[model samples]
Target: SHKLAEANTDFAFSLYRELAKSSPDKNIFFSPVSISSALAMLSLGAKGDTHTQILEGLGFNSEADIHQGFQHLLQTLNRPKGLQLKTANGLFVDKSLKLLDSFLEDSKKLYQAEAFSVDFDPEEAKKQINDWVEKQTNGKIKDLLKDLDSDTVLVLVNAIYFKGKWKKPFDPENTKEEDFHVDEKTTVKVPMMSQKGKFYYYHDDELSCKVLELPYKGNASMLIILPDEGGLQHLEQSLTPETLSKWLKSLTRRSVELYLPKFKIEGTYDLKEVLSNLGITDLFSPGADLSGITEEKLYVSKAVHKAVLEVNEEGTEAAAATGVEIVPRSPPEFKADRPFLFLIRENKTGSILFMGKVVNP
Candidate 1:
């Protein structure tokens, strides 16, 4: 499962580089595990170039049991103990075509998403799928299916929502309006919540950045990478799979002052173009092979993904082991007053559930 999470983290970095390249100065949010698992499920029905493209796009090697990888990946996310995290994937297909029996069984057996046969012509089908996604994310994400294509035969959807609350709850009264550096000459006022405690921290001198791990009340944590004043882009160049492991291994508990912005972000993407650019072109090409899904000639019309994550002061109002962890020689101050990158990982397994950049807030 750790290897599986590394593969998804590899894919996560790839997806981030792509989005970061295109939208250099925009706030970005995405769920890599959600996207990786969704495509892995699709690969169950893809064959020939289609299968290889999807598999390779997700950083899976032929020797690895990709299906088993995700099966373990899904289970690991909720293992030990997790915060308020929820995920669901659904495959809506046109009832006109007959699905391969093996595909249906394997999909449910591994991916746990049963194929829902629907009449695309019925406007109700679009709403049905939309409602399902909204229900999965508790309506934090809505109208995912704004409309359906007239010739649409398949709609693959994945929704992930994480209600991240700090383990050491930040008192709302301490939050103050602060300036966030969006860029060299621009700044925005944001509500910055402050906390002082012993946190898992690592400073990477090579990358010229500080990495801080803020745990929720469970087995997960939000790892923030704060670049030196203006080195956001330079810091991104080293966000590879190996660099992450280095930071994780080097982290040590240290007393520190942390300032995090209270921000709510939502990201929506039509991944056809993005995935194509990543060399998974066959899935969206005219000659795409999806024979394992259905006998009828079918190619992807669109692949959409939506994610919502909110950081607030809601958490268990529990006190820590006070005197046991305190006695410090002046805690180092850690502040996220500039643009930085972050990823929420299931600490036990290192599975990167969500990652993004907060340029302005």
Candidate 2:
């Protein structure tokens, strides 16, 4: 179970580095767990190089292990105290094509993914899939699919929604408009929420950043890494699973003044190209082998992902979707007034649910 969680964490960081490369100065946010789970489910239908590509791209060696990991994770996440988290995986198939019985049984048994029969009427299929996504994310994500080709035989969908109240809730009165330096010279007026308390803190000279833990009401927490202004690029390269584990080990109790922006961030992506860049190329090519799914010729035309993260004085509400504490004398100041990275993960499993770069607010 721990091994599966660790694999997702490593893959989460791996995807982050790749996303950072494409959008160097843009705000980046996505659910690594959601994306990985969807691909894993798809892998059940993939064969030959296509199957291997999905598994390898996700940093997994065993398909069986990956399924078991997801099963354990879903069970654990089902009972997150003081938090609301839900995951949904749906397969919309054109009635003309029939999926393999083995794939169907395995998907429902392991991933709990239900298959939906549709006409692929293009507009109607778009509405149906989008509506399902919206319902699953609690309306945090809507219109997830802009358009689908009528020739499309299958569409894969996955969504995760989570909402949690902070263990140490911030006072609304203390949240005030402040200047947030997006980069070196771009400063925007943002509603900065402040809380003064003792939190799990670390000041790593080697990484040149301040890492702090803000736990939620349940078995989950949000880790924020605030690098020196204009130093996020250099710090991104070194934020591996090893470095993250070390940061956790090095944290100490300290009183600090924290200022985090009250903002909502959303991300939308056509993931096929990105997956290709990560060496999952065969799935998108014509010669792709998804034969385990069906006897007819089939290849994924697109993999769309949508995610949202919102933080306020109360806590956080995220869907596809996918935040703390302490006091001390003469405390250090921890302000996220620049481009910084934030991670939301299950405390017990250490699986990253949502990660993003706040470049603006």
Highest lDDT, which number? 2
lDDT of 2 by residue, 1-361 (tens): 6777767887888888887775555677889999888888888888887888888888878445577778778767767877887787788888998899998898888888868887556788778877888888888887676546677778777778899999999999999998766558677688989999999999989878899999899888899998987677778988777888998899999999998889887666557656787789988878889888899998766666567789999999887721000000111112334578899988877888899888753
> TM-score of predicted model 2?
0.91
Query: Where is model 2 more than 4 Å wrong at Cα?
Result: 62-64, 180-187, 321-337
RMSD of 2: 7.4
Kindly list the per-residue Cα lDDT of model 1 for residues 114-209, writing each as its tens digit: 468776565887778767766777676666666565567667665565665678889899899887665578766789888889999999998999
In angstroms, the error of model 2 at 318 is 1.2
- Whole-model alpha-carbon lDDT for candidate 1: 0.72
State in Å the error of residue 266, model 2.
1.2
* Candidate 1 residue pairs in clash (backbone atoms < 3 Å): none
Candidate 1: segments with Cα more than 4 A from true spot? 78-82, 119-121, 179-188, 315-338
- As a TM-score, model 1 comes out at 0.89
